[PDB]
Amino acid sequence: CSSLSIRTTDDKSLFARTMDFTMEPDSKVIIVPRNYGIRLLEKENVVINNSYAFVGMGSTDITSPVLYDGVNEKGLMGAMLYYATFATYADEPKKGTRGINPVYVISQVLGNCVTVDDVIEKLTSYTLLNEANIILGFAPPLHYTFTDASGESIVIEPDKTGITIHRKTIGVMTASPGYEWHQTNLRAYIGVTPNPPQDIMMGDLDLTPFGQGAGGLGLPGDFTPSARFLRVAYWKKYTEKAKNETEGVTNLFHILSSVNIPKGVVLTNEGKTDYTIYTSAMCAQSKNYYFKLYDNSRISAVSLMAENLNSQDLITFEWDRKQDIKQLNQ
Amino acid sequence: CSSLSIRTTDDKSLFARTMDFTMEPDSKVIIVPRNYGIRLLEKENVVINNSYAFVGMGSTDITSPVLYDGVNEKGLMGAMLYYATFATYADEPKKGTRGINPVYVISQVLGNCVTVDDVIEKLTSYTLLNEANIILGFAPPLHYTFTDASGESIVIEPDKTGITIHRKTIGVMTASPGYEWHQTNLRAYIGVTPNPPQDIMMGDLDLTPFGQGAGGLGLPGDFTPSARFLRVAYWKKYTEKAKNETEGVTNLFHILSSVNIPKGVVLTNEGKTDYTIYTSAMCAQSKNYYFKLYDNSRISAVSLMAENLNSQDLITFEWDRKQDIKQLNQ
Amino acid sequence: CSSLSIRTTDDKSLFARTMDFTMEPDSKVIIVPRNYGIRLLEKENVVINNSYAFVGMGSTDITSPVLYDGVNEKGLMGAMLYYATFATYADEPKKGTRGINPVYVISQVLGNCVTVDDVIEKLTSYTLLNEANIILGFAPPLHYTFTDASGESIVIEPDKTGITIHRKTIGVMTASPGYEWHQTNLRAYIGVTPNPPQDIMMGDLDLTPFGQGAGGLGLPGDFTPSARFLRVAYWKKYTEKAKNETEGVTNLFHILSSVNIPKGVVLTNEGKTDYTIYTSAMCAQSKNYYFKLYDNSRISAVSLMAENLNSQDLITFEWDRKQDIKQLNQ
Amino acid sequence: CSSLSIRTTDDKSLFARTMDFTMEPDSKVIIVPRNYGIRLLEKENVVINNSYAFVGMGSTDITSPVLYDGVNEKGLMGAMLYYATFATYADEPKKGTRGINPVYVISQVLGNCVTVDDVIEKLTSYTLLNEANIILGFAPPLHYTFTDASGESIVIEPDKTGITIHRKTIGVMTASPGYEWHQTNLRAYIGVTPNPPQDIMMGDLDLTPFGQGAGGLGLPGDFTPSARFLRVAYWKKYTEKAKNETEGVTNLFHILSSVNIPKGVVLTNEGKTDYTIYTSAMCAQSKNYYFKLYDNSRISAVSLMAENLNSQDLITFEWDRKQDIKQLNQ
Ligand SMILES: [Cl-]
Ligand SMILES: [Cl-]
Ligand SMILES: [Cl-]
Ligand SMILES: [Cl-]
């Protein structure tokens, strides 16, 4: 997975992510209303009544809704992404905390926090535990990003030493290694720019670029988390600023096209195809959630505030996996 | 620009391209009917009557329709793409030939040819001339690709030495240098694969990848024509085969996502933004033409055979530059 | 600069480094005998008596010899290397420590320590201070590597948070960033191997490498400290094991050939050439010190033990900057 | 193998090469005197009298001396390097030519040519034949480079279409593909320079290089022939001009250190180590021949003109594989 946030010229914060994985568990757009109640652990029936309604992509396959990303009615945005070989969870909670299953972190935070500081305060009351789930069969190795209405972003990483918080980050996150490593890695690529290099001579030979784009020489094109981070970060820096919410969604999806993974192009060590199942964006000020799918390029949108946020039940929207082609003539 | 063709499992041939440029002159989908007539040179009133109707993207700003790419009623597909520093044209026709403006080549070929052999045979009675056009102010440096209904592809390059023809190619083309150079460059990257490298040790340190995608190590991520050719070619090789026409369009657009250029990421030496204006695909068997735009992710389609192919006038369809977002609620 | 250690199959440990800089202050091979004495600070009179004799490259331009690298009579080896933007020193010593000038660290450690644990204990007794020196005009930003006769290596980095010690490392060190960063970066390159990739097809086209060496695709060739680290580490991994001390020296100099910088190839932002001034190797068991220079490919050697270890003066050997070409005929 | 020529400030031309191979057939420095005579073919009796004496590295294991590279008494320099998958030889000579074994081309040309013009005229008189030899057991795939005393260089490549000649080249040659391919590939890397990139911001984060060297971002560091060509060419361009013959040798060897392959680092698909067996340089004006070996960094020199050029027998000099270490103690 890959993710970033941007700010528009009309003072709106937007966040977007690709979800890259090897299977499509039954996933849909889920609106969780206020006071629905969300479990902390799947093997215990302790429930936190959530203050806030929120909308995002997720699964209803276990006891409480598992949100992969989303935005709440107070403009807080966030996502869980993979963090293989780095994520570390405890067997028992630390003194003064309750255990939480890593897959309920987004649902719990979007249900209960407004600012990135709220999020940091909230997570001190919990210890992530090594609790499995039936969709995957194991606890996935995860890390977490949040962006609030102000545009401030944070990264939360369950490292071997404990929870590592990174404040006021560049608003880009992919997978392993840790955020500091990628932030440092950025420095090796500062020569990657939009501008062409000057012509040179070798002897009596004039040498000029083949066409355009030679300013990017040195940027990698593979789909490793470190390469994905570089592409999302550099193209976030150089893509034109979005003037409004629509341009924000459009631009986010253009930046993420450089990390969109076709089926077959990346295989796991077991030969499973790891691909971009969907791409989503969300806006803190409007509380609109947008998505497109591997099989459908047409962006769909769900407005959180359009619904009865005191509903008794979840409100869900199913994926349309048919390429939604506008016929201009028969 | 970047382009490729694929074959589906149900025996269809499709071809697609991105159009990368610094300005958007009035462009639209054009159907040219049979017996419309296409000029050879913009300054002379000699026309060739076209045997075949065709559809594609182009301009109606000069005397005859200028098609950037398209498919004809007999399944022939093709496109003109940039070829800077290589394209060479003459001031006067070679003896035995007529001159032709480089921008009229796709129109003439789609109007009169069925097979890739037909195209090769057809281009021998013409010399490309350095005639300007009002759309750009100069003759753009171009080379040409064609794929016929059988899936065979050719590249035609106006080199300093004369027209260079490559037959039965890999069905990928971007910009400069010439096709043999890119086909040779492929060999340097055969280690770019979907599969992860094996873990190693250094002393007592075990070293494993950060996540997935490390089989791609070495593939460049910049937008030079050589890097674009590599990415299209390798992702064409490893993306899952399309089962049908709709999977074809979807897969073509996923492979081209890797060479989709966001505005601001590539600047020319004049400071102009070079970005992916549209992405199109077309199918030899159905004669359907499909496109999406920088500002509009939803794919539209025009069927050539749905129209009156003996119509007197061009039939056109205008771009919809609004992001066509499906609203799932209210 | 770049550095590594290796172990031979006859149980010897060797260490080598390049010295890359923009000018050559008066440098030479220095033997410091036992009980000679070394200052901790230029501005204070305290002289620490050294228990052990040592040899290495260094300067005699300040009060006590400054060794850039070397080996002592107990087989402890070490070197100081650049650490730009990371090294940070204090104005005053911490409670219960003595201040030390960064450039006197190698002289103090070689003079008084045998194992890497000894080095770690010795350093707790000191605080590195921001004291300048006359050779450069400022306190240079440095980090340190040591390798004892057992072949265990450590890295000591004066970070913003305090002294960071890395134990039992891979025995490679260049410049910034920190050792943990580079050791993590190794993981992105585990696909760099001696073995060629298998042939592939694209359609009917068979693709095979140009020659040999394609297993290394992905490895960077520039002279940045991260690129230098990767090349030293991967080439350390795959270069044939040395069977004796002479092969050990030979192999070290071959591995470092991949990070040997010709004059003019790397300029600072003032346009000064940063080049490899010398390359040195040393062996814990023999106490031999070997070196070649930019202008002289012939390796020269100095034996520590051959000299009077109780000498009452330094013993120095001057550089021969003339290419030492053996004339095979008149 | 890798090769280049340079011109000194004092107007001397020098040429150098590495020899990279998987085995070391008995090789030495050979002076071939005038009128010694060189076979064209092993299976036919004709010996061609050589007008000129020459010196270089080679083999005496077959009928006539086989020189791998060398310089003649009129200042012509040249070498044969590998050209896998591209070299194409005939079964019979073309009408009007004599057949020649590919391994005898250097001896015949050095024995009889002065200028690159002469070399071209000479090669038009031959057809390279698919004749084997008892050193390898097969006709090795080869291509050839020559530099005359004026400093003009040519490349001669036995392609499938016939001999291809490239005149006044940049004075760099490695292995496959053909010279025009590599010369075009140089254009993709014109952004590889000695100078650092400017610092950038990302949000509030200031990004600066780790150290020095970041102008080189993009240059590959693997040992394939295309990567070796880029490193030799770019470092020939930016390495300071050699002021005299001795600096010329030193600089050539520094440039070639970037393509010096340690044993173990490159294996063939038959698991053989391909490594740099020797590195040689030669000077057209002095007719001095210089070399170092994998196991001995000290350069030896042979002067052609010092010998009796009308001697009846070869004059040879054996390799000294012992690392020739200057012992400084006394
Ligand atoms: Cl281009
Ligand atoms: Cl990943
Ligand atoms: Cl090779
Ligand atoms: Cl550095």
GROMACS .gro file of C-alpha atoms in nm, chain D residues 7-328:
model
  322
  997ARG     CA    1   4.526   1.250  -2.480
  998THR     CA    2   4.770   1.415  -2.238
  999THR     CA    3   4.840   1.791  -2.197
 1000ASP     CA    4   5.179   1.727  -2.361
 1001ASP     CA    5   5.011   1.583  -2.669
 1002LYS     CA    6   5.058   1.213  -2.620
 1003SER     CA    7   4.800   0.948  -2.699
 1004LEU     CA    8   4.756   0.653  -2.462
 1005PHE     CA    9   4.520   0.358  -2.472
 1006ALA     CA   10   4.429   0.115  -2.190
 1007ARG     CA   11   4.222  -0.196  -2.132
 1008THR     CA   12   4.117  -0.442  -1.873
 1009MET     CA   13   4.113  -0.810  -1.963
 1010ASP     CA   14   3.820  -0.984  -1.794
 1011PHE     CA   15   3.798  -1.360  -1.839
 1012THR     CA   16   3.720  -1.687  -1.665
 1013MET     CA   17   4.058  -1.852  -1.713
 1014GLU     CA   18   4.413  -1.754  -1.760
 1015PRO     CA   19   4.582  -1.928  -2.055
 1016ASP     CA   20   4.956  -1.871  -2.043
 1017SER     CA   21   4.996  -1.504  -2.145
 1018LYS     CA   22   5.293  -1.268  -2.124
 1019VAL     CA   23   5.425  -0.948  -2.280
 1020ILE     CA   24   5.546  -1.018  -2.635
 1021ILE     CA   25   5.765  -0.807  -2.863
 1022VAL     CA   26   5.719  -0.932  -3.218
 1023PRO     CA   27   6.020  -0.811  -3.423
 1024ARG     CA   28   5.998  -0.688  -3.783
 1025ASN     CA   29   5.973  -0.963  -4.048
 1026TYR     CA   30   5.879  -1.228  -3.798
 1027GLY     CA   31   5.569  -1.331  -3.994
 1028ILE     CA   32   5.210  -1.390  -3.880
 1029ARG     CA   33   4.967  -1.660  -3.998
 1030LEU     CA   34   4.623  -1.550  -4.125
 1031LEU     CA   35   4.472  -1.892  -4.047
 1032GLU     CA   36   4.572  -2.193  -3.835
 1033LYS     CA   37   4.452  -2.448  -4.097
 1034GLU     CA   38   4.621  -2.280  -4.396
 1035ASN     CA   39   4.997  -2.228  -4.441
 1036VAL     CA   40   5.021  -1.863  -4.560
 1037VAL     CA   41   5.231  -1.641  -4.335
 1038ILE     CA   42   5.222  -1.267  -4.392
 1039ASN     CA   43   5.552  -1.085  -4.337
 1040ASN     CA   44   5.501  -0.800  -4.084
 1041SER     CA   45   5.660  -0.468  -4.178
 1042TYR     CA   46   5.657  -0.333  -3.821
 1043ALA     CA   47   5.761  -0.453  -3.475
 1044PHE     CA   48   5.506  -0.433  -3.196
 1045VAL     CA   49   5.472  -0.501  -2.821
 1046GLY     CA   50   5.172  -0.609  -2.616
 1047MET     CA   51   5.009  -0.880  -2.411
 1048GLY     CA   52   4.938  -1.210  -2.568
 1049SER     CA   53   4.985  -1.581  -2.620
 1050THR     CA   54   5.258  -1.791  -2.785
 1051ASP     CA   55   5.056  -2.115  -2.767
 1052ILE     CA   56   4.954  -2.127  -3.136
 1053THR     CA   57   5.148  -2.093  -3.463
 1054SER     CA   58   5.202  -1.721  -3.458
 1055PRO     CA   59   5.187  -1.484  -3.162
 1056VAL     CA   60   4.832  -1.379  -3.075
 1057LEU     CA   61   4.828  -1.030  -2.933
 1058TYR     CA   62   4.534  -0.919  -2.721
 1059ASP     CA   63   4.638  -0.553  -2.739
 1060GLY     CA   64   4.956  -0.361  -2.806
 1061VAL     CA   65   5.139  -0.075  -2.976
 1062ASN     CA   66   5.361  -0.090  -3.285
 1063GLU     CA   67   5.677   0.104  -3.373
 1064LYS     CA   68   5.472   0.360  -3.566
 1065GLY     CA   69   5.242   0.436  -3.271
 1066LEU     CA   70   4.933   0.243  -3.375
 1067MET     CA   71   4.755   0.101  -3.068
 1068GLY     CA   72   4.469  -0.148  -3.055
 1069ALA     CA   73   4.289  -0.432  -2.875
 1070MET     CA   74   4.044  -0.708  -2.925
 1071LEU     CA   75   3.761  -0.728  -2.673
 1072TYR     CA   76   3.463  -0.967  -2.632
 1073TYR     CA   77   3.150  -0.912  -2.844
 1074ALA     CA   78   2.914  -1.188  -2.733
 1075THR     CA   79   2.593  -1.259  -2.931
 1076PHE     CA   80   2.685  -0.994  -3.192
 1077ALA     CA   81   3.008  -1.119  -3.358
 1078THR     CA   82   2.939  -1.305  -3.682
 1079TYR     CA   83   3.209  -1.478  -3.895
 1080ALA     CA   84   3.187  -1.643  -4.238
 1081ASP     CA   85   3.264  -1.998  -4.342
 1082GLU     CA   86   3.454  -1.890  -4.657
 1083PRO     CA   87   3.620  -1.560  -4.755
 1084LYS     CA   88   3.426  -1.321  -4.974
 1085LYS     CA   89   3.557  -1.290  -5.333
 1086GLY     CA   90   3.867  -1.071  -5.342
 1087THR     CA   91   3.961  -1.111  -4.973
 1088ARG     CA   92   4.175  -1.346  -4.768
 1089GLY     CA   93   4.035  -1.541  -4.476
 1090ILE     CA   94   4.161  -1.451  -4.130
 1091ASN     CA   95   4.118  -1.606  -3.786
 1092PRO     CA   96   3.955  -1.348  -3.552
 1093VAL     CA   97   4.236  -1.399  -3.297
 1094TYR     CA   98   4.504  -1.292  -3.544
 1095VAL     CA   99   4.348  -0.956  -3.634
 1096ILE     CA  100   4.547  -0.752  -3.378
 1097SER     CA  101   4.880  -0.913  -3.468
 1098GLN     CA  102   4.820  -0.859  -3.841
 1099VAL     CA  103   4.709  -0.497  -3.799
 1100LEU     CA  104   4.981  -0.392  -3.556
 1101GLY     CA  105   5.232  -0.567  -3.784
 1102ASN     CA  106   5.133  -0.376  -4.101
 1103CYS     CA  107   4.931  -0.054  -4.038
 1104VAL     CA  108   5.014   0.298  -3.922
 1105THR     CA  109   4.694   0.512  -3.928
 1106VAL     CA  110   4.330   0.426  -3.866
 1107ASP     CA  111   4.280   0.484  -4.245
 1108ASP     CA  112   4.533   0.199  -4.302
 1109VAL     CA  113   4.350  -0.026  -4.056
 1110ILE     CA  114   4.024   0.030  -4.241
 1111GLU     CA  115   4.189  -0.045  -4.581
 1112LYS     CA  116   4.349  -0.358  -4.427
 1113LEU     CA  117   4.024  -0.495  -4.283
 1114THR     CA  118   3.848  -0.454  -4.623
 1115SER     CA  119   4.109  -0.702  -4.761
 1116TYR     CA  120   3.999  -0.978  -4.520
 1117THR     CA  121   3.698  -1.184  -4.427
 1118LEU     CA  122   3.694  -1.301  -4.063
 1119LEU     CA  123   3.631  -1.677  -4.068
 1120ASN     CA  124   3.468  -1.910  -3.816
 1121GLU     CA  125   3.798  -2.082  -3.746
 1122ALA     CA  126   3.866  -2.206  -3.395
 1123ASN     CA  127   4.192  -2.217  -3.204
 1124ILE     CA  128   4.341  -2.455  -2.950
 1125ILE     CA  129   4.353  -2.203  -2.668
 1126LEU     CA  130   3.971  -2.177  -2.634
 1127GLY     CA  131   3.845  -2.451  -2.862
 1128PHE     CA  132   3.614  -2.212  -3.052
 1129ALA     CA  133   3.636  -1.882  -3.239
 1130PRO     CA  134   3.571  -1.622  -2.963
 1131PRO     CA  135   3.311  -1.351  -3.049
 1132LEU     CA  136   3.520  -1.031  -3.081
 1133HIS     CA  137   3.532  -0.665  -3.177
 1134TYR     CA  138   3.824  -0.439  -3.223
 1135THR     CA  139   3.938  -0.089  -3.134
 1136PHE     CA  140   4.234   0.108  -3.268
 1137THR     CA  141   4.389   0.443  -3.183
 1138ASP     CA  142   4.668   0.591  -3.396
 1139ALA     CA  143   4.943   0.833  -3.292
 1140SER     CA  144   4.721   1.131  -3.387
 1141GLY     CA  145   4.472   1.010  -3.122
 1142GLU     CA  146   4.190   0.924  -3.365
 1143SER     CA  147   4.003   0.602  -3.256
 1144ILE     CA  148   3.791   0.358  -3.457
 1145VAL     CA  149   3.577   0.061  -3.372
 1146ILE     CA  150   3.544  -0.238  -3.602
 1147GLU     CA  151   3.257  -0.476  -3.539
 1148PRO     CA  152   3.191  -0.803  -3.723
 1149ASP     CA  153   2.816  -0.777  -3.737
 1150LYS     CA  154   2.557  -1.012  -3.890
 1151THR     CA  155   2.521  -0.770  -4.183
 1152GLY     CA  156   2.899  -0.749  -4.230
 1153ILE     CA  157   3.188  -0.547  -4.085
 1154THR     CA  158   3.068  -0.219  -3.931
 1155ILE     CA  159   3.324   0.061  -3.899
 1156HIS     CA  160   3.281   0.364  -3.671
 1157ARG     CA  161   3.522   0.646  -3.737
 1158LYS     CA  162   3.646   0.921  -3.494
 1159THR     CA  163   3.462   0.767  -3.195
 1160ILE     CA  164   3.473   0.888  -2.830
 1161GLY     CA  165   3.759   0.648  -2.757
 1162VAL     CA  166   3.574   0.406  -2.528
 1163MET     CA  167   3.481   0.043  -2.594
 1164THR     CA  168   3.364  -0.247  -2.382
 1165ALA     CA  169   3.163  -0.542  -2.508
 1166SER     CA  170   2.816  -0.594  -2.667
 1167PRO     CA  171   2.603  -0.439  -2.805
 1168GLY     CA  172   2.744  -0.249  -3.104
 1169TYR     CA  173   2.916   0.088  -3.075
 1170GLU     CA  174   2.626   0.302  -3.207
 1171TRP     CA  175   2.404   0.147  -2.935
 1172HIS     CA  176   2.640   0.251  -2.656
 1173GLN     CA  177   2.699   0.594  -2.811
 1174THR     CA  178   2.322   0.656  -2.811
 1175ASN     CA  179   2.289   0.515  -2.456
 1176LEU     CA  180   2.536   0.788  -2.335
 1177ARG     CA  181   2.253   1.041  -2.399
 1178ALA     CA  182   2.037   0.889  -2.118
 1179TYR     CA  183   2.301   0.975  -1.866
 1180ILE     CA  184   2.405   1.332  -1.941
 1181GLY     CA  185   2.269   1.421  -1.599
 1182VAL     CA  186   2.555   1.224  -1.441
 1183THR     CA  187   2.798   1.498  -1.338
 1184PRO     CA  188   3.053   1.579  -1.070
 1185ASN     CA  189   2.836   1.854  -0.921
 1186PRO     CA  190   2.598   1.820  -0.626
 1187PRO     CA  191   2.223   1.878  -0.666
 1188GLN     CA  192   2.070   2.179  -0.493
 1189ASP     CA  193   1.900   2.131  -0.155
 1190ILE     CA  194   1.516   2.119  -0.162
 1191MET     CA  195   1.228   2.151   0.082
 1192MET     CA  196   0.948   1.903   0.132
 1193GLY     CA  197   0.696   2.086   0.346
 1194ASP     CA  198   0.900   2.220   0.634
 1195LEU     CA  199   1.173   1.956   0.590
 1196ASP     CA  200   1.514   2.073   0.445
 1197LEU     CA  201   1.674   1.797   0.240
 1198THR     CA  202   2.043   1.799   0.168
 1199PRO     CA  203   2.284   1.526   0.036
 1200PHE     CA  204   2.440   1.273   0.278
 1201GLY     CA  205   2.788   1.383   0.176
 1202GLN     CA  206   2.943   1.432  -0.164
 1203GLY     CA  207   2.897   1.253  -0.494
 1204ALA     CA  208   2.524   1.299  -0.553
 1205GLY     CA  209   2.576   1.446  -0.903
 1206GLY     CA  210   2.640   1.085  -1.010
 1207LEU     CA  211   2.281   0.972  -0.923
 1208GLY     CA  212   2.160   0.743  -1.202
 1209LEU     CA  213   2.492   0.588  -1.303
 1210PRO     CA  214   2.478   0.207  -1.265
 1211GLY     CA  215   2.744   0.027  -1.070
 1212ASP     CA  216   2.699  -0.336  -1.197
 1213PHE     CA  217   2.951  -0.502  -1.430
 1214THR     CA  218   2.747  -0.548  -1.748
 1215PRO     CA  219   2.905  -0.416  -2.070
 1216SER     CA  220   2.658  -0.123  -2.101
 1217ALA     CA  221   2.720  -0.020  -1.738
 1218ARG     CA  222   3.096  -0.051  -1.787
 1219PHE     CA  223   3.075   0.164  -2.104
 1220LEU     CA  224   2.887   0.440  -1.913
 1221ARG     CA  225   3.130   0.447  -1.625
 1222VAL     CA  226   3.441   0.450  -1.848
 1223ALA     CA  227   3.288   0.717  -2.073
 1224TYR     CA  228   3.158   0.947  -1.797
 1225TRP     CA  229   3.473   0.915  -1.589
 1226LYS     CA  230   3.695   0.967  -1.897
 1227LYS     CA  231   3.497   1.288  -1.949
 1228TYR     CA  232   3.529   1.425  -1.597
 1229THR     CA  233   3.868   1.294  -1.481
 1230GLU     CA  234   4.136   1.567  -1.479
 1231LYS     CA  235   4.357   1.578  -1.786
 1232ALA     CA  236   4.679   1.385  -1.753
 1233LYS     CA  237   4.975   1.623  -1.784
 1234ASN     CA  238   5.230   1.372  -1.908
 1235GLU     CA  239   5.273   1.004  -2.004
 1236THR     CA  240   5.311   0.881  -1.642
 1237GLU     CA  241   4.997   1.070  -1.527
 1238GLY     CA  242   4.833   0.924  -1.834
 1239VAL     CA  243   4.894   0.570  -1.717
 1240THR     CA  244   4.789   0.651  -1.361
 1241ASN     CA  245   4.467   0.822  -1.477
 1242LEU     CA  246   4.376   0.547  -1.724
 1243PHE     CA  247   4.414   0.298  -1.440
 1244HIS     CA  248   4.203   0.514  -1.208
 1245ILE     CA  249   3.927   0.534  -1.471
 1246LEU     CA  250   3.946   0.157  -1.515
 1247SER     CA  251   3.933   0.092  -1.138
 1248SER     CA  252   3.558   0.158  -1.170
 1249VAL     CA  253   3.527  -0.151  -1.395
 1250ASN     CA  254   3.786  -0.366  -1.217
 1251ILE     CA  255   3.608  -0.693  -1.122
 1252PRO     CA  256   3.719  -0.877  -0.804
 1253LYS     CA  257   3.710  -1.259  -0.819
 1254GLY     CA  258   3.370  -1.400  -0.709
 1255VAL     CA  259   3.165  -1.088  -0.785
 1256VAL     CA  260   3.062  -1.197  -1.138
 1257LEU     CA  261   2.991  -1.563  -1.224
 1258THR     CA  262   2.884  -1.701  -1.563
 1259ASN     CA  263   2.589  -1.934  -1.601
 1260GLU     CA  264   2.843  -2.217  -1.578
 1261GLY     CA  265   2.952  -2.085  -1.241
 1262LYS     CA  266   3.292  -1.961  -1.360
 1263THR     CA  267   3.437  -1.647  -1.204
 1264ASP     CA  268   3.482  -1.371  -1.459
 1265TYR     CA  269   3.739  -1.126  -1.314
 1266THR     CA  270   3.991  -0.866  -1.422
 1267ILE     CA  271   4.303  -1.072  -1.497
 1268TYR     CA  272   4.522  -0.777  -1.595
 1269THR     CA  273   4.508  -0.408  -1.679
 1270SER     CA  274   4.741  -0.265  -1.950
 1271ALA     CA  275   4.817   0.079  -2.100
 1272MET     CA  276   5.036   0.181  -2.393
 1273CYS     CA  277   5.160   0.512  -2.537
 1274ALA     CA  278   5.182   0.585  -2.914
 1275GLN     CA  279   5.469   0.837  -2.895
 1276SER     CA  280   5.702   0.645  -2.665
 1277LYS     CA  281   5.594   0.293  -2.765
 1278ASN     CA  282   5.603   0.198  -2.395
 1279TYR     CA  283   5.372  -0.084  -2.277
 1280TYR     CA  284   5.255  -0.088  -1.913
 1281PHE     CA  285   5.066  -0.345  -1.707
 1282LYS     CA  286   4.949  -0.464  -1.366
 1283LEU     CA  287   4.781  -0.796  -1.271
 1284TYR     CA  288   4.504  -0.915  -1.043
 1285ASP     CA  289   4.766  -1.020  -0.786
 1286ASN     CA  290   5.021  -0.739  -0.832
 1287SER     CA  291   4.925  -0.368  -0.819
 1288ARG     CA  292   5.274  -0.256  -0.914
 1289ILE     CA  293   5.291  -0.142  -1.276
 1290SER     CA  294   5.564  -0.288  -1.498
 1291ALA     CA  295   5.681  -0.127  -1.823
 1292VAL     CA  296   5.839  -0.264  -2.144
 1293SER     CA  297   5.991  -0.024  -2.403
 1294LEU     CA  298   5.955  -0.153  -2.761
 1295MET     CA  299   6.230   0.064  -2.906
 1296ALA     CA  300   6.489  -0.056  -2.646
 1297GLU     CA  301   6.510  -0.391  -2.821
 1298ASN     CA  302   6.662  -0.513  -3.147
 1299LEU     CA  303   6.362  -0.478  -3.374
 1300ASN     CA  304   6.537  -0.701  -3.632
 1301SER     CA  305   6.577  -0.991  -3.387
 1302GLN     CA  306   6.507  -1.340  -3.519
 1303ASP     CA  307   6.302  -1.450  -3.219
 1304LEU     CA  308   6.022  -1.312  -3.002
 1305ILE     CA  309   6.131  -1.122  -2.696
 1306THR     CA  310   5.898  -1.205  -2.403
 1307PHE     CA  311   5.851  -1.098  -2.042
 1308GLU     CA  312   5.675  -1.315  -1.788
 1309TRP     CA  313   5.413  -1.205  -1.537
 1310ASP     CA  314   5.514  -1.168  -1.174
 1311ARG     CA  315   5.200  -1.272  -0.982
 1312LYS     CA  316   5.353  -1.185  -0.643
 1313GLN     CA  317   5.208  -0.860  -0.494
 1314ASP     CA  318   5.523  -0.646  -0.523
 1315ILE     CA  319   5.525  -0.475  -0.187
 1316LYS     CA  320   5.785  -0.213  -0.105
 1317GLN     CA  321   5.920  -0.283   0.243
 1318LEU     CA  322   5.986   0.055   0.409
   0.00000   0.00000   0.00000
